[model samples]
Target: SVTVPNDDWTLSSLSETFDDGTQTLQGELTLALDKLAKNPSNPQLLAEYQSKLSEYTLYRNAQSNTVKVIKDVDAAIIQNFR
Candidate 1:
């Protein structure tokens, strides 16, 4: 599972420094509504961010499901199971 972090939030999974010779680019943003609410005093801004986050999450889930369906179709086609 790939977790993407929000622009305003930092991810704990991601390291600030490179661990090996090559930099590891694997990390995701965490969405903490409570944290955002505590930091951002503007209700409009918070609502907007929350809305955008919801939209993004929905799109991501849809795309992921679509990919899974495609993979299943490919497997079925190859094995003649369907």
Candidate 2:
């Protein structure tokens, strides 16, 4: 459903890209989940929420790991020289 910028996208930009996707999905998931709470018998709503969780959570975890690594490398560079 979503595509990356692909070429020339560095780790920093990749983190931002992931952030945007996760945030959008999170917003949708929250709305769907709230609706599901009132209409708990709707199987379709539950299924939609489940799928959203998988993709967004996976991408969010990847963003966490990648951003941590990127920040670590930047710190190392600053320690070494200008």
Leading candidate by lDDT: 2
User: What's the TM-score of each model vs. the native?
Assistant: 0.20, 0.40
Query: Which runs in model 2 stand beyond 4 Å of their true positions?
Result: 1-9, 50-82
Per-residue alpha-carbon lDDT of model 2 for 3-74, expressed as tens digits? Answer: 353433554565555555555545554676676566889876555544311334532222223453343345
What's the lDDT of the predicted structure labeled candidate 1?
Answer: 0.33
Worst 10 residues of 2 by lDDT: 52-61
Runs of candidate 1 with Cα error greater than 4 angstroms are 1-35, 52-82
Total residue pair clashes for candidate 2: 0
Q: What is the lDDT of residue 21 in candidate 1?
A: 9
| Residue 12 lDDT (model 1) | 26
Q: Which pairs in model 1 have colliding backbones? A: 4-29, 5-28, 5-29
lDDT by residue (1-82, candidate 1, tens digit) is 1345542133222222222101111111123334445668776534533432233453222122334334333543343322
Number of clashing pairs per prediction, in order: 3, 0
lDDT of each: 0.33, 0.47
Q: Give me the candidate number with maximum TM-score.
A: 2
Please list the Cα RMSD from the true structure of every candidate, rounded to 1 decimal place. Answer: 16.3, 11.8
